Amino acid sequence: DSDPRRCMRHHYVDSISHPLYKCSSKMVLLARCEGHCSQASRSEPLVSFSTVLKQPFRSSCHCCRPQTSKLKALRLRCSGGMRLTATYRYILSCHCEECNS
Amino acid sequence: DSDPRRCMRHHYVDSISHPLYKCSSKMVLLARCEGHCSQASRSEPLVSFSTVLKQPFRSSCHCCRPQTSKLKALRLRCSGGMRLTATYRYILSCHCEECNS
Amino acid sequence: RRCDPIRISMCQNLGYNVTKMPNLVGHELQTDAELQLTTFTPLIQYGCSSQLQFFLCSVYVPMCTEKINIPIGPCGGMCLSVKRRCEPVLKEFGFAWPESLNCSKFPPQNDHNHMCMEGPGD
Amino acid sequence: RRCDPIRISMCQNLGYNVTKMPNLVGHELQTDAELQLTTFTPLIQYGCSSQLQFFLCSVYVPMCTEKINIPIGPCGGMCLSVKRRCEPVLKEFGFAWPESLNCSKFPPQNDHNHMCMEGPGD
Ligand SMILES: *[C@@H]1O[C@H](CO)[C@@H](O)[C@H](O)[C@H]1NC(C)=O
Ligand SMILES: *[C@@H]1O[C@H](CO)[C@@H](O)[C@H](O)[C@H]1NC(C)=O
Ligand SMILES: [Cl-]
Ligand SMILES: [Cl-]
Numbered sequence: 001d002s003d004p005r006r007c008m009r010h011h012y013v014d015s016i017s018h019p020l021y022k023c024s025s026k027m028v029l030l031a032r033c034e035g036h037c038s039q040a041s042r043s044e045p046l047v048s049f050s051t052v053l054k055q056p057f058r059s060s061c062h063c064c065r066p067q068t069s070k071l072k073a074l075r076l077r078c079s080g081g082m083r084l085t086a087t088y089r090y091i092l093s094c095h096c097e098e099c100n101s
Numbered sequence: 102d103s104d105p106r107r108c109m110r111h112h113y114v115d116s117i118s119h120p121l122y123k124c125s126s127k128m129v130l131l132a133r134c135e136g137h138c139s140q141a142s143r144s145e146p147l148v149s150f151s152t153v154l155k156q157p158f159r160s161s162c163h164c165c166r167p168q169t170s171k172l173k174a175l176r177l178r179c180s181g182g183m184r185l186t187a188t189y190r191y192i193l194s195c196h197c198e199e200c201n202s
Numbered sequence: 203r204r205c206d207p208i209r210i211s212m213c214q215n216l217g218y219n220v221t222k223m224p225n226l227v228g229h230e231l232q233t234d235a236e237l238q239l240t241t242f243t244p245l246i247q248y249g250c251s252s253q254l255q256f257f258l259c260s261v262y263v264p265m266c267t268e269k270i271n272i273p274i275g276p277c278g279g280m281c282l283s284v285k286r287r288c289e290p291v292l293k294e295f296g297f298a299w300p301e302s303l304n305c306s307k308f309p310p311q312n313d314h315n316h317m318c319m320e321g322p323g324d
Numbered sequence: 325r326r327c328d329p330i331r332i333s334m335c336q337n338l339g340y341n342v343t344k345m346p347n348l349v350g351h352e353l354q355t356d357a358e359l360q361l362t363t364f365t366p367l368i369q370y371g372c373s374s375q376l377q378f379f380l381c382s383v384y385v386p387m388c389t390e391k392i393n394i395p396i397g398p399c400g401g402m403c404l405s406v407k408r409r410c411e412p413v414l415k416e417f418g419f420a421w422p423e424s425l426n427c428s429k430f431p432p433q434n435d436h437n438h439m440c441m442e443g444p445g446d
Binding site for chain 1: 106108117119120121122131132133134135136137138141142143144145146147148149150153154157158160162163164165166167170185186187188189190191192195200201
């Protein structure tokens with residue numbers, strides 16, 4: 001759809017700093033998933049018996065999450081000699097996923 | 102007027118029966134949670150300098166769930182004098198809480 | 203073919219979708235029930251009890267289900283809960299807790315013996 | 325009779341109400357300035373710097389006031405501030421910090437000697 005409140009990918013930047021070495025802070029363009037899933041979340045009671053072990057409730061809930069991502073590297077510029085490397089997932093797509101898969 | 106989309110308690114009657122043994126079913130009033138939490142769900146990458154990465158993402162997601170409930174027990178008369186205890190929960194209130202918290 | 207939809211606006215989307223007249227108070231038409239419900243609008247507005255609107259609707263347009271011959275109304279405990287918060291406000295206006303909502307004419311709690319809708323203890 | 329209103333939408337309601345062409349970059353029409361401003365929309369969207377949109381507008385549609393013969397643009401410090409956060413993002417896309425926004429061509433700070441708009445140090 002085209003609903004701006006849907007579960008989709010958003011782009012943002014952040015400043016990254018290594019906490020253990022003295023390095024220049026680094027700007028990095030990142031992506032996140034955010035939105036509202038179309039599926040109503042819900043929860044009902046289950047009935048247990050002596051021979052039927054069941055959880056108190058059966059639940060469903062959809063969350064906006066990364067569907068596909070990709071490892072991405074971040075070379076820092078540090079004390080004049082060295083280069084440290086951060087990594088993180090660059091999100092490529094988002095989807096609505098069951099809360100507890 | 103009340104928003105039919107909010108996280109709320111729905112009421113319904115259903116039958117308590119043993120899924121196998123053969124028994125005297127019993128009619129019972131139940132409640133369930135259903136609706137859309139107002140908080141948007143999201144997921145962000147975490148940045149790691151350390152080995153590899155650990156949990157790649159940090160996320161929040163709200164699910165419509167039972168907040169309080171009454172623990173009920175009842176007895177069915179099954180084939181033969183035998184009586185079987187069934188346990189279930191009558192939901193009193195629903196709220197929106199974190200998926201993994 | 204047993205239950206009718208709810209045509210009273212202030213009693214829609216509260217947890218059940220159909221009802222059946224006559225209600226627990228005697229009205230034979232939802233239109234009459236709606237009219238009398240309106241007399242409670244101020245009380246509801248005041249935030250007297252978060253359960254008030256639901257409790258009144260459960261009495262004036264009781265839950266109907268195809269699976270049994272009786273309507274489902276509130277349990278006595280919800281009535282008392284609402285009453286204890288709401289009666290005093292009515293008295294401030296020189297009104298009494300109506301006899302039609304006498305809490306003692308509701309089942310005392312939800313069990314197989316008698317279906318009634320409970321609410322949160324707090 | 326000295327200043328014109330701001331006709332570029334993305335540069336309205338930012339702290340001043342009128343401007344004057346030519347701007348600090350050479351454009352003789354706001355329409356040309358608007359066009360070139362559009363090339364920065366993605367960068368602005370990314371949240372690169374909360375000051376970016378204001379800084380660009382202060383350059384492309386500088387503040388005009390009837391009380392003096394020159395336009396009022398950004399101070400060099402705001403430029404550097406934005407640049408340090410924004411240049412790296414541009415490089416990720418294979419672009420340079422444009423020479424037209426060379427921070428060293430702006431006054432270094434707001435004083436009587438030269439009016440320029442500063443922004444927060446953090
Ligand atoms: C209704 O309530 C009034 C006062 O609470 C009381 O006199 C009466 O006992 C109640 N009705 C019944 C049938 O008990
Ligand atoms: C503009 O910046 C470039 C690089 O920052 C530099 O070569 C030049 O000195 C600056 N312009 C002036 C007039 O200083
Ligand atoms: Cl309350
Ligand atoms: Cl910023």
